[PDB]
Ligand binder design. Structure first.
Ligand SMILES: CSc1nc(C)nc(N)n1
Length: 208
């Protein structure tokens, strides 16, 4: 059913720095996530050029932003490449151990938390605004899995029995209570325009 894993020591540290350092520019999480979505879409697009059947699990290449004021979640959905079970457990396909080290050194030489994406670890910036992150992913080579973590050093992975998704990743951010500004339509729009204005895939902002 549910497997529980410990994060490697450098990720646990990376997540704790993110959660504990006072840093008011939290809004960069969205860009970091849309930027992961865009890389994952590049990937399925490049593979499909030589094997069109990779798009049998969906032809449309895009990003959806889904706010839900009742559940208090912001969900970032793409129909990108997805992750296999092994890649989800291996730091969601990131080079988190070496990127974190390098990032921490840059933080001592004048870098700041907004540069997290330059180190291949921007996914973890979700924890600037989220108390819990769930990630649902479907790779063409595998079943559908849910990853989840509220930090504190562990994450869980299970087969996902929610609704089948064709292919891609949904990052579901359960927001901290003081961060609900990220569920507001004109907030999200503003942030997309400031940091992700020109991206190679269409972004749809869902309304409620
Ligand atoms: C490798 S596919 C992928 N990986 C991450 C971290 N996020 C998304 N959206 N896709």
């Amino acid at each position: 059913e549910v497997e529980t894993f410990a994060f490697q020591a450098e990720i646990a540290q990376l997540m704790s720095l993110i959660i504990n350092t006072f840093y008011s520019n939290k809004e960069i999480f969205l860009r970091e996530l849309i930027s992961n979505s865009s890389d994952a879409l590049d990937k399925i697009r490049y593979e499909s050029l030589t094997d069109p059947s990779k798009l049998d699990s969906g032809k449309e290449l895009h990003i959806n932003l889904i706010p839900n004021k009742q559940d208090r979640t912001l969900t970032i959905v793409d129909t990108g490449i997805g992750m296999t079970k092994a890649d989800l457990i291996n730091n969601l396909g990131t080079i988190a151990k070496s990127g974190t080290k390098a990032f921490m050194e840059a933080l001592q030489a004048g870098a700041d938390i907004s540069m997290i994406g330059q180190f291949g670890v921007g996914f973890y910036s979700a924890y600037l605004v989220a108390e819990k992150v769930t990630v649902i992913t479907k790779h063409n080579d595998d079943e559908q899995y849910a990853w989840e973590s509220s930090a504190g050093g562990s994450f869980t992975v299970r087969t996902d029995t929610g609704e089948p998704m064709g292919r891609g990743t949904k990052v579901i951010l359960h927001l901290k209570e003081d961060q609900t500004e990220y569920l507001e339509e004109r907030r999200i729009k503003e942030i997309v325009k400031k940091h992700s204005q020109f991206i190679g895939y269409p972004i749809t902002l869902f309304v409620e």
